[PDB]
Amino acid sequence: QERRWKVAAAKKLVRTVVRHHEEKQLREERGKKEEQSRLRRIAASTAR
Amino acid sequence: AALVVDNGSGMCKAGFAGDDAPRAVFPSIVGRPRHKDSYVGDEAQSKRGILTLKYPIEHGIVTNWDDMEKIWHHTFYNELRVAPEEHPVLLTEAPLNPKANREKMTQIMFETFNTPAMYVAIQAVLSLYASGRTTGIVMDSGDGVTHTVPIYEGYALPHAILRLDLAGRDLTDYLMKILTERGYSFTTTAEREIVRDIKEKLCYVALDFEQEMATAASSSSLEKSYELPDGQVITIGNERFRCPEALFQPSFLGMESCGIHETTFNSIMKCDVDIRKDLYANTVLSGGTTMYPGIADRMQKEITALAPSTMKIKIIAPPERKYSVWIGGSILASLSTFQQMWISKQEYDESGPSIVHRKCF
Amino acid sequence: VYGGDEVGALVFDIGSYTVRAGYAGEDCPKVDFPTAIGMVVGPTYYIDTNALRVPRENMEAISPLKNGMVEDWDSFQAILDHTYKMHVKSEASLHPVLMSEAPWNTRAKREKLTELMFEHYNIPAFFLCKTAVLTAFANGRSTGLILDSGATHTTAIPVHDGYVLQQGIVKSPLAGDFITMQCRELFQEMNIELVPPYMIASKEAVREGSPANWKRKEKLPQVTRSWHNYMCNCVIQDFQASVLQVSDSTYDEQVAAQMPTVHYEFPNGYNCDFGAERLKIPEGLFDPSNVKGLSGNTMLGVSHVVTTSVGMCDIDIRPGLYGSVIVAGGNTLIQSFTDRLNRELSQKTPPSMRLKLIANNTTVERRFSSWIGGSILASLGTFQQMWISKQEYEEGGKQCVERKCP
Amino acid sequence: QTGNWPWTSPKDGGLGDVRYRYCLTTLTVPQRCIGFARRRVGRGGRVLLDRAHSDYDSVFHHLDLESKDLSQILVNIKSCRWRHFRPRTP
Amino acid sequence: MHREVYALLYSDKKDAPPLLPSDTGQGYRTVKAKLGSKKVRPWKWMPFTNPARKDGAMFFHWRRAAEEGKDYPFARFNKTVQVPVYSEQEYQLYLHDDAWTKAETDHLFDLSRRFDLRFVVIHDRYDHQQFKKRSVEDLKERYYHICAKLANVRALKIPVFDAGHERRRKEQLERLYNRTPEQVAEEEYLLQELRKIEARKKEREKRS
Amino acid sequence: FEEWFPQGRPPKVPVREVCPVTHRPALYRDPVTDIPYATARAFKIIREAYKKYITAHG
Amino acid sequence: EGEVTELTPCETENPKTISHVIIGLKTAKGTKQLKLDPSIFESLQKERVEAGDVIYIEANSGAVKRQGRCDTYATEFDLEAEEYVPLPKGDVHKKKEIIQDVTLHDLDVANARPQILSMMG
Amino acid sequence: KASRLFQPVQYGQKPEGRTV
Ligand SMILES: Nc1ncnc2c1ncn2[C@@H]1O[C@H](COP(=O)(O)OP(=O)(O)OP(=O)(O)O)[C@@H](O)[C@H]1O
């Protein structure tokens, strides 16, 4: 039982770490696109 | 916040969870006066002439527990300047560490520092955490020991772990010997620190050792100059890759062993055939002894030569790999899912130091 | 009263293929290095993988174990010293030692091993348990039929109440070494030149069946024939693990040909499809009468060895033996080996007795089962009475092992 | 019926010893039935809940406070044909 | 579907992991005060005397400081199966048998004390090379006869052994085991045919 | 947008304070020492300890 | 119904534009994410729903109603009564049947005089 | 803080209120 638990806990922690890094990277990419859209919004307001 | 303390054979990395880099890094050395009472870290190296310098961590294994306790005390009180009884402490252990050592670490943390919560993680899994990959093999090379730990789905395979005694300290001694062969003077115990610096600044890994040797023998364009602390300038050439080459050709040091690439291949072969593809596709390099330039390309070519041509080889060497173990430990300690893994004081009171085996893996 | 007490004992399982060692209480051996060691003409010994895999002039490859029993005590002492110093990193006199032994180990060899452990290593306590008992304990079974297929022998060992029924031991020479020999013969018939990986400097990708385009390493020192044979055996064992598969039923040429092939690439870059020949080799473990070696031989198949071993025991215990069949040993990891064995046994077992194969088909549970059982046994609080103390070895002498360890 | 080991169900000829039996269990945190479980004391005295896989695990997760398979499971539980433990203070 | 599940180690490879108990599961911050209010008791690596051992060797434990010097609790499990002890005189007077040598009987009793009357293990360990070959029934008969005789000589009553019944039982079991697949298939075919005959008879009786 | 959709971090679970005198679940905190307590005797003990501390410190 | 764990709007390009409002609800049984209509953002700010607030949302109207801070965030040192409520038990999504017994005279009295005119009445 | 005025109490012992 301890062996089964340790294997599963290791898998759980590693998949959580992988998702954490995936989320951080996608958040950075979304931030870059958001900044682009923000500058476009300011330009649109000035144009209006 | 949690305290992440990575005790290495040469250098200790400590800091708070979630930080990008360790808050304090200092040499792991204890100084006692020949006839405060004990100085740890750079304070000891500045007083070599009056203090007895002893390394308690040899090849990643703790030898003198009093010195290790003093190192941890110095870390908590002076480096991080935090109370151990207030913050959880996440420690790291070397692969294949004796069971009694992990038990002693647990006992020291709970009975001497009154830590509220503790955990011990294997350094290779932390390096893999920093790499962000589910399955791979970690080639961690530190100051005193080199390990090759294959990891499948986050669970280290203890049987397939291979240990190599060649590490940064032996490379420093080899560079010292080579410089003495060139005629420079560095045999003194203090000059060893200068050889370490020139190794960190000028050394690089040759992609093709024989071609680089022939080119450096024919032309001096591969030579570079380094200024000694006293103002003297020395020019070193051909040595720049002869020193790192000892990692791949340990016979240079006189040690009859396999190279780091051969050790990695052997550790991979010790694993199951199905998982070997994932191990080859994810070869993670960590530790200070892997920061030489071009080491990734040399390891890639060597593993490609050893591995089948139908297998895809991909060496992962992030630029921050010197602290990969501590970055992974900080990520783990910052995770919400890990919060259930903390060994609580009550668990130690009711079960003793063997609780570390029940919870930590 | 409470959970089992851990007294910091060591568990050693020195097999013919790999030496498994570790600390009691762990769920996996902390080290497993090849039993074959390098010897230079005491003689200089190279024991671990890091030292064995590098060429050396006039270095022979030898093994301390013979037919599952230690023959050369000097190499055994060398292996123990290496294990302690490198992997254990602890003084031998500080930790009790629990070692496994073959079911058929002789009295004199047991006495010599006890004498060595107490006089030379000055260990505080010692115990010697059978591999079958430890394998049964790792599965929580106090009784059952152990089926071990290692490198030297395939043996069925009936265990009752934690005791090996020595009268029921049936051993067969068909094991990992036989499969290695069969693969060697197959490669010879196919004119495949086995190039060990140590001789290859560089290689280029080639088409299937195309001549190998490889460069030989320069300045290679002369090597003994034993070391070259050992490296060839290593690559052959890698081929065995990666390609070979046991047929789900009695071997048929048509059915084997219909199934898809498996592609393997040799170290020298040579690659080929092994077609149906990959299935013929493991069938020899089940039907030795078809093996090219000796069709008229008297060797017994693994299922026949199983049925014979149980047939030699008291019929009152046969229900327990069939009701708990434990498969162990590295040679049993061959694909579909467990399924074929289960089918053949269900066909041959009497319907009046229940047959159940324990689901332990994993590398760790199959190869290290003896070490797992040893760690379990050494971790029991009730077992602390079984230890042989140094005082007991002093008073009762070398013969004390005969009575303390059943 | 042919005999069987004690750690096997009486429906399979075993003695059905209660220490090896896995039964549906509900926890206080989270308030959700975890499925089939058995209380086992660990090495350091830590009481562990072993869990057995079942194809109806999702239904057992949805099960609390006492469609075809769900209806049959509910009918069986309401008739108390299944032993389903719940924790209570002593 | 199954009402309950039974297994020894674990039920299936797909089994969910066991739930370990732990504090701080809901986060360290909420349990900060509880953990900080107390301090752990000291644990020691200490030697312990095991009174079950006759030599007196001292092994080491992880135990609390207050538990030092306490009697080992697992020593309470130490108890052997009661087996009588007889002198040379008592054997010559009562236990003499022309069919059994005295040294052979002493060897049998030594094996019985070593293996806690597990007569199958005694039979496996029986020295058939030195002494005469004995079946497990012969060993059981000799042991139970000697025990009954010693009890009657000294002092209650014990059930007598019936070697013949056990021999017949084993012979029948062996005969049932050695039969070919065709013979067992014929037995099951006769069982099913008899069951169908009885079923038809019962149906006719029910109709009447 | 950020006014209408603030990305609020979930509230941290509060520290379940415990009385240092009787180790009971804390119901109060003394305004002067900011130390929690659960009974009047605990309050008296805390204030006596506080005056001891403040005499020792200065 | 459940304790709110997130209120993240889902930004999108219009064919800042939001196309959904994701609300995460936690109960003792578990956690569920709901892809609610974007219009619910008005009711969320009207009800001042925040992370850690227990709410319930009716399927038909889609309007949110707030019922207090989850009791897991209540300390013994702060004084409020109505603003704290225990974490809902049961599944996040619930189907409730309410059966009420009335008489025709009860309806007569209810519709004859519904409950400043109310003050004077 | 409570730790600044009071000794923590060993597990299994009744709190009494010993100061630093
Ligand atoms: N996955 C695998 N597939 C096929 N063969 C394997 C596999 N793993 C190991 N083997 C083979 O198993 C054989 C026996 O290995 P094992 O570890 O069981 O031996 P041992 O118990 O140490 O030795 P012995 O019983 O011969 O004294 C080896 O020859 C090895 O090549």
Ligand SMILES: Nc1ncnc2c1ncn2[C@@H]1O[C@H](COP(=O)(O)OP(=O)(O)O)[C@@H](O)[C@H]1O
């Ligand atoms: N930029 C660099 N290039 C090469 N080596 C380096 C560099 N920086 C540090 N090192 C080496 O890293 C080694 C320490 O590695 P580390 O992983 O900290 O070992 P440990 O963890 O055992 O303390 C030292 O020998 C040091 O010389």
Ligand SMILES: [Mg+2]
């Ligand atoms: Mg290190």
Ligand SMILES: [Mg+2]
């Ligand atoms: Mg074997």
